[PDB]
Each structure stands twice: as C-alpha cells, then as structure tokens.
Nucleic acid binder design. Structure first.
Lengths: 228, 51, 137, 102, 150, 120, 50
RNA sequence: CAGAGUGUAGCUUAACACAAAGCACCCAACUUACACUUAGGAGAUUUCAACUUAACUUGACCGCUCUGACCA
C-alpha cells in the first residue's frame, strides 16, 4: 500500500443563468455601436412606411398608420412583467439555494467533521481498487443526502491536488497523509431535497469562497476555479 | 464573461436598420436580439402540437 | 563522392518531426527582417561580403578624442520620463497627433541633437568620407 | 438594389468625432485586460492540471494512464447561453403554431 | 555542388511539406453556434477562432450554415385562426478544429462556455465518421498527388 | 560616373544605386537611415534619440514618421547627400505614413531618384 | 496467400540502371519478430512458384 | 517558521552609450472567419543607500521560488 490516502474530490459548479451586467465603459461602447449601426444602414420597411404616410397626409388607403402600430407594441410590453434578475434569496442572503447569484458561478461546499471538528471542504470519497480516479468523484453524488442532480464531467484528468499530513496525532508509517484530486463537473439540472439544507451544504462564489475554506486548502482551490 | 464577445455591430456594407428587442421564451426567460421592427418585446407562444 | 559540411547548415536547427505545429512566417516583411539578419553574419562559405565588402583589419581601431562625459543614467531617465507624461496629459497634443496635424520644431531638435548624439553621427559620417582613413591612417 | 431605401447621411460634428475617437482608445485597453485575465486563467488551469497529473503518477502509475484517456461520453456536449431574465416558475404562454421555412 | 561541403544548402522543399482520433487526443471537433442574432454568432465564432490560435489548436475550417427562417404565428384574440406575429431567423456558425487532447479539453470547454453570450447555443460534435472530406484543390496539389499515384 | 551595382534582377531589393533611404518602423520606434551601396550608413534619424522623442506624443504614429523625414532632410543637406533611392514594398508605398515621409524628404530638398550613370 | 500478380502495376522510383540482384542487401537484414529465418546468400528472382 | 536560491512589462546572454531595445500582445478597418496589411493603444529595471557609470557590483529591504518546520 501507500502512506497517502487517495480521496476523489468533486467540484460541482453552477453555470451563470443570467448575463452579467455591463460595465459603465461597456455601456458607452454599446450605445456607440447602435448609433453607428443606424447611420450605416438603409431604411427599413417600417421606416419607409412612415415617410410615405407623412407625405400622403400632407397632400390630403391604410387603416393602421406606422406610428399608431408602434403604440400597440409598447402597450403589450408594459403589461408583461419580466423576471427579476435579483432574486429573493439574494436579499435574504440564503447561500443554500441555486436561485441566488444567477450572474456568477456557484461552487458547492459541504461541511464534514474530522477529529471532532467541523471543516468545510469539497465533496470527496476514498479511492477504491478496480475503479478509476474519475469514477471516485462520480460516486460522491450517490453519497449525498437526497440529491437528484445530473453532473457533466469534462475529461478524466484531475483539475488539482492538495496534500496534508496528520498533526502528529494519528500520523503513522502506514498512514502518513493524504492526496486529494479535484474533479470539476457542470451541474446540468437538479437541486438537493428539502430534508437538510442549512447544515448540509452551501453554494458560494470564488470571491466568497475563502470564508469557509482554510487558507492552505483555499490556495489549491482558487487555481482551477475561474471567475469569468 | 458573457460580455467577452457580446458587444458588436452589423459588419455588412448593405443592411437594413435593426432595433434592440427582447425575445421572451416559453418559460419567461428573455434575451436581447435585433429585430426588423421596433417591437419592445417578443414572446414565443407554446405550440399546440407539443402538448 | 560527398564531403561533410565545414560548419552548421542554415536550416539544420529546424525539426521536421512536428512540421505541422510550427509557427510560420505568414508574411513577406517577417521573412525579410530575418533574412537580413543572417546576411550580416559570418559564414564558412563564399559570400558577397567576402569579395565586395570593404576589407578591414581585425584589430580594433583606437580612439584619440576627448573622454566621454559622465552622466547619471538614473537621473537622466527620470527627467525624460516626467516630460513625456506632461506632453501626453495635454488633450490638444493628442488631438493634433490623432489628426496628423502636429509637427515638431526642427530648429529645437537639432539644438538637442548636437549636444547628445551629434558627435557620434559626425564620427560615423567622417568614417564614410574616409577622413580618419587618410588624416590619421 | 433600389436606391429609394437609402437614408440621408447626416454629418458628424467635431465633438461627435472627438468623443468616438477617444472612446475607441479606452475600449482597446479594456479588451486588453479581458484577454490578460483569460490568458492567465488558462495558464493557471493548465499549470494546476499538469502538476496534478505528475503527483498522480508517483502515487499510482495505473491511475495516471486512465486520466489521460479520452472520454467517449463527453461528446456531444450541449450548453445554452444565459438569458436576460430568469424563467418564471408560474407562467402560461399563449397558444400558437410553428412553421419552418427552408 | 554535390562534391562540395555546401551541397544541399538551397534545399527548401522539405521545409514546407516534407482523420483518426486516438485514445488521448480527439480527432476533429465541430463547434456549432446557434443564435437568433447574426452578429452574436459571427463575433463568438471569431472569439473562438482567435482563442484556438492562442492555445495552439489548428482550425480546419470556419464556415456558416444556411439560414433557416421560422414564422411565428399567434392565436387571434377571441378566435380560432392563427395570425402572423413575428418572423424569427436562426443563424449558425461552425468552427471546425482538430487536434485537441483530452486533458486540455476540460480547460478549453470551460473557457468558451463561460464567455458564451446570451441567446447563443453551443453544440460540439464529432463528424469525422461522416467524412465527406472532398474539396476543390489547386493544380499543383493535384499534380503532386497524381505524381504519387503513378 | 561611378558604376552602380547592376543586377540582382530575381531578388529584392535592387542594388543599382549610390544611396538608399531605408525606413525601419518597429513596434515602438520609427527609424530612417541613409546608407551607401557598400553598406556604410551615412546619416540616421530615429525616434529613440531624446532630441526627437521629447517633441512627439507617440513615436509609432504617422506624425512621428513625418517628423523623422523633416529631421533627416536637414541632416541630408548638411551631409551633402542630395540624391537617394527609396525602395518600398507595395503595401509600404500605399501606406499613409510613408507617403508623408516622402513628402518631407521632397520638401526638404532631397530628390528620391538618383541621376542616371554617365557611361560615355 | 501471395498474389501471382499485382492488381495495379506501378512505376518504380528506383533509377532505371538496376542491379536488383547484384550486391549486398540493404534492407530486411535483421530479425524483427521471430528468432529463425532463411538467409539468402545470393541474388535471384522469386516468382509465384517459389 | 527558518534555510538556501533569485530579481528588466510575456520571452531574451537587448541595453557600450547617443539609449530603457527587439519580438510577443490588444482594439478598429479589410476577411464568412483566420492571416496579411493599414491605422491606433498599453506597458517594465523589487525598493534603498554604498568613492560613481552601477538595468550591470555589494548588503539590507523586499517579493518570488524551492525544501523541511507547521499540517484534517
């Protein structure tokens, strides 16, 4: 055997649901692109309709005018209510629901107890004989408490590794430390059940990831977790 | 970021004017697209056959 | 009959195994710049410079002029950097530079040229006329 | 092809040209930072992945041979882009019919 | 000259010239970019094409698919006849790349999906089995290939 | 009456001249050189020297290229060099910065075409 | 099974001046997979009968 | 936590001084796109003193890397 335990970590990420709002510099450029587009385009069928109607009215068989139809479009739009980009969970700061922070990616964190101490880490399982290292990460989903989620794994190679040693208490020749390997996957659809939410798992971004993780553990995690 | 390649303009020598419109999907989600007419919103109805 | 080369071949360093994933030139100017670099380098074969280039003695030519002035580079560089930021801060210069209407005063340029690098250009120009060749051998 | 659809070309004032010209120089620097962050992000992922594989081979060379293999189930991969608003939990779109022109 | 040590100094032909997918690298990947906006598909395909060059990935071909026009009919108010509402046009851009390793695929796929604009659909599939790798070639290409055949 | 190095018909650039105006524009700097047929450089004018750098908003724009020619033209007259050839690529000739550099040399009294050699 | 004749004849890339049976061999002179082989100590032509 | 090692924007054995250079990189226009080209943009000596030229030599200060301490 080996003195380092092999643990197959899993890094489940929630892709952004809504587009991130444009920066003030981007807003200025966005207006310029549309302003240039109008100046370098021909008259549309709607614009040519309005000009002809103006000439005919000035001189004097269309029931609906160009401007009149535009008002109808505006009235229908004001009746429909668009989805709220900022959800209630954002106001409540409930870091357990996927509904929060739709603009940014979310990383799953689960709290586990080691040495009679609770530590927030990524989901992981011990490697077993006759099983690939990637298959260990897929097994972690089955061990979760009442989870119905389909994860999309990208490749087979690990996305990171962390090494730690027992603090001279349980350190032995047969068990000197452990080497975890992080596997990233995409959360296609699904969410946890309502049985256990608060103490079970939380979903935070990379910026708010350091609060839960340890400084040494966070060092190897902020490397394969992007903030784009 | 979704803004990495989002802000662009029509790179055509000849083309008709387009207006920024919202395309509401069948589940309420909306997306910014450019339409021929200045319709403030567009909502795709649900097909009767796909029921 | 074959004879091994007396020196490294021109394109010997190129590896033919991964020829598909090798950066190309893609342009005439990029090849021309590299082509001129190797044309100014010594070669073990016969070259144009061997027969037409002006023969010079391998011994370095002596310098018999005044010793070079002593200037502190760190202070010289800092003062030059500060002037650039002030010039670029003005919006009138940038507008004139963008409109391709700005110009430099030629009289002031030569005043600084004659003090900093003027003597070195004169030495290079004098060598072209061969004044050092005849006056001082 | 008809020239009746052409719109009049309104001249741009000096300030309008000045603002656009200064706006394009700031947009060039803004896009340079986006590429810089993306370039480092790809480098960061590549360095961590390559370093992780080296540690895997030392611990167990058999598991290293499986990580570097391709994933037949990986493709095809389908990912839809974000939307301007989240979906409405309770919404009933109207009825209609879809016809495709090819 | 052949007997001279400088023989072959002028050789250039080996410098210029002289699919199957292995278990470690994917053979050919076709990236489909479906979006209702024509400019978004063109811009994102340009972004992907520029990304492949920076990451040292060969791009076989970047082309466009035929546009499919979709008519949207909405039910008339208090009636049974479908009336014309809007016309939605579907634009697709295909960027074909080959020579991507499995290990580097995880990073490549995550980068592109992160920068995916709104309303743009991403579809990556392999079509090397369909083959159809036949395109018009220039005369020198035919001459060299025919020379091998003889 | 001095012979020009005729030949080099299948390569670029030509060598049938006495003096050549060679413009080197890099990523940050723009440099123009006047060099003899044997390779010796007669006079130089670049944006790297403090004399021209202190009066330029940017050393890589058209203004910098035009300013080099105005400075070089004065140096060409002082050096006694009045005739020189310019051998640009088709894209360099069509470029706007090289057009104004040629204008600066012409307005400075330098003709961009050498007189033909006298054989008889 | 060895075909009597090639399906499609092909022009060889060797020079027309051929010494095909004359001189020492410069190919297939070492063992590749097995341990025993028949060594040729002379030049000749092998046809379908051989 | 010490121990050594190390220092120019991404790279470089570019930097004698006349001078912080060359390439790589970014935007726009041209291209379906890439590429070319044209037209633009951002850049750096870890910081201090040492008889002074010290990006160059010394140490400090500093950051970084590496190996152990530390470690779930």
């Amino acid at each position: 055997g080996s003195p380092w335990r092999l643990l197959g970590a899993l890094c489940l990420q929630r892709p952004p649901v809504v587009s991130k709002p444009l920066t003030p510099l981007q807003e200025e450029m966005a207006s310029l692109l549309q302003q240039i587009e109008i100046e370098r385009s021909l008259y549309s069928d709607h614009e040519l309709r309005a000009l002809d109607e103006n000439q005919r009215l000035a001189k004097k068989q269309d029931i609906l005018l160009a401007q009149d139809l535009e008002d109808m479009w505006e009235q229908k739009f004001l009746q429909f209510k668009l989805g709220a980009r900022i959800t209630e969970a954002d106001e409540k700061n409930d870091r357990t629901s996927l509904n929060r922070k739709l603009d940014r990616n979310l990383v799953l964190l689960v709290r586990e107890k080691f040495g009679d101490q609770d530590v927030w880490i990524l989901p992981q399982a011990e490697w077993q004989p006759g099983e690939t290292l990637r298959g260990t990460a897929e097994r972690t989903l089955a061990t979760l408490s009442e989870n119905n989620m389909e994860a999309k794994f990208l490749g087979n190679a690990p996305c990171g590794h962390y090494t730690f040693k027992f603090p001279q208490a349980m350190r032995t020749e047969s068990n000197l430390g452990a080497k975890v390997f992080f596997f990233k996957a995409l959360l296609l659809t699904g969410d946890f059940s309502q049985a256990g939410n608060k103490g079970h798992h939380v979903w935070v971004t990379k910026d708010e990831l350091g609060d839960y993780l340890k400084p040494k553990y966070l060092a190897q995690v902020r490397r394969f977790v992007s903030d784009l | 970021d979704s803004s990495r390649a989002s802000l662009t303009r029509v790179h055509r020598q000849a083309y008709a004017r387009l207006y920024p419109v919202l395309l509401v999907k069948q589940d309420g989600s909306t997306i910014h697209i450019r339409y021929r007419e200045p319709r403030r919103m567009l909502a795709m109805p649900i097909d009767l056959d796909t029921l | 009959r074959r004879t091994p080369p007396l020196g490294p071949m021109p394109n010997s360093d190129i590896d033919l195994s991964n020829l598909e994933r090798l950066e190309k030139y893609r342009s005439f100017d990029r090849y021309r710049r590299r082509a001129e670099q190797e044309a100014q380098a010594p070669h073990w074969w016969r070259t144009y410079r061997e027969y037409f280039g002006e023969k010079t003695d391998p011994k370095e030519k002596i310098d018999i002029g005044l010793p070079p002035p002593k200037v502190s580079r760190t202070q010289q560089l800092l003062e030059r950097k500060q002037a650039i930021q002030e010039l670029r801060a003005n919006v009138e210069e940038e507008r004139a530079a963008r409109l391709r209407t700005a110009s430099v005063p030629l009289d002031a340029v030569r005043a600084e040229w004659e003090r900093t690098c003027g003597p070195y250009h004169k030495q290079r120009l004098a060598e072209y006329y061969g004044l050092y060749r005849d006056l001082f051998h | 092809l008809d020239k009746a659809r052409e719109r009049p070309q309104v001249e741009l004032t000096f300030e309008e040209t000045e603002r656009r010209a200064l706006l394009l120089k700031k947009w060039s620097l803004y896009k340079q930072q986006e590429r810089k962050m993306e370039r480092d992000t790809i480098r960061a992922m590549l360095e961590a992945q390559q370093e992780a594989l080296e540690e895997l081979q030392l611990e167990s060379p058999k598991l290293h041979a499986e990580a570097i293999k391709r994933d037949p189930n990986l493709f095809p991969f389908e990912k839809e882009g974000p939307h301007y608003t989240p979906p409405i939990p309770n919404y009933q779109p109207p009825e209609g019919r879809y016809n495709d022109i090819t | 000259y052949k007997t001279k040590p400088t023989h072959g100094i002028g050789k250039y032909k080996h410098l210029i010239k002289a699919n199957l997918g292995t278990d470690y690298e994917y053979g050919v990947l076709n990236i489909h970019l479906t979006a209702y906006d024509m400019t978004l598909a063109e811009s994102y395909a340009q972004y992907v094409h520029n990304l492949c060059n920076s990451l040292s990935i060969k791009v076989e071909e970047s082309y466009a698919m035929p546009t499919k026009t979709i008519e949207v009919l909405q039910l008339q108010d208090q009636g049974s006849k479908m009336l014309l509402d809007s016309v939605l046009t579907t634009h697709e851009r295909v960027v074909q790349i080959s020579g991507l390793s499995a290990t580097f695929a995880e990073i490549f796929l995550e980068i592109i999906q992160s920068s995916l604009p709104e309303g743009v659909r991403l579809s990556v599939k392999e079509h090397t089995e369909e083959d159809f790798k036949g395109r018009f070639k220039a005369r020198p290409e035919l001459e060299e290939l025919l020379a091998k055949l003889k | 009456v001095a012979r020009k190095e005729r030949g080099w018909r299948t390569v670029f650039p030509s060598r049938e001249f006495w003096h050549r105006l060679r413009v080197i524009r890099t990523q940050h700097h723009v440099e123009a050189l006047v060099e003899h047929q044997n390779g010796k450089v007669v006079v130089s004018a670049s944006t790297r020297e403090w004399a021209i750098k202190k009066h330029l908003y940017s050393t890589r724009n058209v203004v910098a290229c035009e300013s080099i020619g105005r400075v070089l033209a004065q140096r060409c007259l002082e050096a006694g060099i009045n005739f020189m050839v310019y051998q640009p690529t088709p894209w360099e000739a069509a470029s706007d910065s090289m057009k104004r550099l040629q204008s600066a040399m012409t307005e400075g009294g330098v003709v961009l075409r050498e007189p033909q050699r006298i054989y008889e | 099974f060895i075909e009597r004749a090639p399906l499609v004849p092909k022009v060889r890339r060797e020079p027309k001046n051929l010494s095909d049976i004359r001189g020492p061999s410069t190919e297939a002179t070492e063992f590749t997979e097995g341990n025993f082989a028949i060594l040729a100590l002379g030049g000749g032509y092998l046809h379908w009968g051989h």
